């Protein structure tokens, strides 16, 4: 029944779940350099964005 804005607030306080949510903000942070050493960080995109719907909500989610 809990949504994102629910675990997001607690996630930040918790710590781990906090830096994990930044995954979206990190993607841009890395772009700062503009060299994202292609190869690994590139292929990761294969299932890296998937964590979006995974972390977004907590386990207690029917999602």
UniProtKB/Swiss-Prot annotation:
Organism: Hepatitis C virus genotype 1b (strain HC-J4)
Location relative to the cell: Host endoplasmic reticulum membrane; Host mitochondrion; Host cell membrane
Entry function: Ion channel protein that acts as a viroporin and plays an essential role in the assembly, envelopment and secretion of viral particles. Regulates the host cell secretory pathway, which induces the intracellular retention of viral glycoproteins and favors assembly of viral particles. Creates a pore in acidic organelles and releases Ca(2+) and H(+) in the cytoplasm of infected cells, leading to a productive viral infection. High levels of cytoplasmic Ca(2+) may trigger membrane trafficking and transport of viral ER-associated proteins to viroplasms, sites of viral genome replication.
Superkingdom assignment: Viruses
From-to range in the entire protein, with total length: 747 to 809 of 3010
Cytoplasmic topological domain: 33-35
Topological domains, Lumenal: 1-11, 58-63
UniProt topology in membrane: Multi-pass membrane protein
The protein's assembly and partners: Homohexamer. Homoheptamer. Interacts with protease NS2.
Name listed for the protein in its UniProt record: Viroporin p7
Residues annotated as transmembrane: 12-32, 36-57
